Design a protein around this ligand. Structure first.
Ligand code: FAD
Length: 472
């Protein structure tokens, strides 16, 4: 009944103790007493991380009841919000103030604490991950009680703690640098690899938001651009290629959304590469029939409800600077498509490619000493289309092998770092040792992160098995 499960049902936990304080004073008392008794209190937001980063069998603390907007600074365009607020609640609260977030990370149901603590991101070559939106914060620490951090109050600890994986304190309050509320024009169109390469450098720098959806085993890339705003196909015709392909396989089809159609297609034979080729070809035809323009407020256009169950792996890797472009982002995709074909991986769509500016947070996968660094983020996916336990098991193993080939063939070469909400802990002790050392190479600040953990959480009450495994 009080099992906590993630979005895709890949991780679940029943914590022995579950705390949901209604005030800072109540939280301060929970942290002091947990510290005195040496009892685990892993901070949890919405609990939606694909890897169950927030999960603990021992103890979890939720700030969901502490979700108020405390202050809007009209002149500085800043909001101070309790960390238990969902992104959606902040968006709704900012609407009458004419403000919005600089960027979004797909789902509006995540909490502000969970959003910043993993270094979540959207797309936009000139826009950093969301940990860089943080101007100041308050943190309840086991060692020092409630502390305030900002560029003016212990900047070094601030830049660690704001992207701190819940390991440095319970965030109570965050001040975010907002931008004016604004409409975006979203353009969806298809291109080949060749057309993408031709326009790529200029497209990234001349469009506020650019995202590619690569369709494996096709030469279709779906390009989506969004910019501030100063033959039409029916839904039935857009879905026709997927509906026709599903009728061809041994079986109301007409009731299914696009995402339910892709799931029902993949469910036929999810690990058969020749079948996945046909599913991906049908999906490419859907996207060709989906070219066009939408207009909406930035939160509506940049936000997605998603909905499927899936395995995801996303890596950040450097792709030069605004002034000195790098080809590493297109070269990565070239090698990844070659790897999928060469190895016969039943890779469904999309392989999602996004861009951020660098972050000054040392634990950001997109950490850079340069503010105008550009990072490419590449997400691979396999869907879990049914609750069939044997099929889920087979796809889980296929995804592990798919990710492992990217890790061994590409990640070190490109300096790729895994998203903190998507990274899985290996069980093999040699692979775990190897990952711990890889994290020290990918993250210059790992030793300083552990130093801050010893300083703020000496009895290690904020860390779960995952944190202990990655950062011994
Ligand atoms: C369908 C889906 C789509 C996604 N799309 C994107 C995307 O586009 N871009 C992207 O970057 N990410 C994306 N994510 C990942 C998501 O942004 C992260 O998993 C995020 O951490 C979820 O927020 P949450 O409130 O569920 O956090 P949780 O999973 O509950 O917690 C995440 C981390 O925050 C810590 N934490 C939470 N609250 C506090 C607090 N008050 N104080 C201290 N630590 C705290 C936890 O200990 C944990 O380390 C997606 C996830 C899903 C399921």
């Amino acid at each position: 009944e009080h099992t906590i499960t993630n979005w895709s049902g890949t991780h679940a936990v029943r914590p022995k103790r579950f705390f949901q304080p209604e005030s800072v004073e109540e939280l301060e008392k929970i942290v002091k007493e947990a510290h005195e008794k040496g009892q685990k209190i892993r901070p949890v937001g919405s609990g939606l991380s694909p890897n169950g980063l927030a999960f603990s069998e021992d103890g979890m603390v939720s700030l969901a009841l502490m979700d108020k907007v405390l202050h809007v600074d009209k002149e500085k365009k800043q909001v101070t919000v309790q960390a238990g607020a969902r992104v959606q609640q902040v968006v709704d609260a900012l609407r009458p103030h004419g403000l919005t977030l600089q960027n979004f990370a797909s789902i509006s149901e995540q909490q502000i604490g969970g959003f910043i603590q993993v270094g979540a991101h959207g797309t936009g070559a000139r826009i950093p991950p969301v940990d860089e939106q943080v101007v100041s914060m308050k943190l309840v620490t086991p060692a020092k009680g409630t502390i305030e951090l900002s560029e003016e109050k212990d900047p070094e600890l601030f830049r660690l703690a704001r992207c701190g994986l819940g390991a440095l304190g319970v965030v109570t309050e965050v001040t975010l640098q907002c931008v004016p509320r604004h409409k975006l024009l979203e353009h969806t169109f298809v291109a080949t690899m060749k057309e993408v390469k031709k326009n790529h450098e200029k497209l990234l720098r001349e469009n506020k938001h650019v995202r590619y959806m690569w369709i494996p085993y096709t030469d279709t890339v779906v390009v989506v651009t969004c910019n501030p705003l100063p033959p039409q196909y029916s839904e039935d015709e857009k879905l026709q290629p997927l509906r026709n392909l599903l009728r061809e396989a041994a079986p109301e089809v007409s009731g299914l959304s696009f995402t339910e159609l892709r799931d029902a297609l993949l469910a036929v034979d999810p690990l058969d590469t020749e079948w996945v080729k046909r599913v991906n070809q049908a999906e490419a035809e859907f996207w060709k029939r989906s070219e066009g323009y939408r207009v909406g407020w930035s939160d509506e256009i940049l936000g997605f409800d998603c909905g499927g169950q899936q395995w995801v792996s996303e890596v950040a890797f450097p792709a030069g600077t605004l002034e000195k472009p790098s080809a590493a982002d297109l070269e990565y995709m070239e090698e990844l498509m070659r790897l999928i074909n060469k190895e016969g991986i039943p890779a469904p769509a999309p392989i999602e490619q996004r861009w951020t500016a660098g972050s000054s947070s040392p634990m950001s996968p997109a950490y850079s000493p340069s503010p105008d660094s550009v990072f490419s983020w590449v997400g691979i996916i396999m869907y879990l289309p049914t609750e069939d336990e044997e099929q889920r098991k087979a796809i889980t193993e296929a995804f592990r092998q798919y990710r492992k080939l990217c890790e061994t063939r590409l990640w070190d070469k490109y300096g790729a770092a895994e998203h903190w909400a998507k990274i899985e802990v290996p069980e093999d002790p040699e692979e775990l040792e190897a990952l711990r050392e890889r994290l020290r190479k990918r993250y210059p600040g790992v030793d300083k992160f552990n130093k801050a953990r010893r300083e703020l959480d000496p009895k290690n009450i904020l860390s779960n098995d995952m944190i202990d495994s990655l950062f011994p």
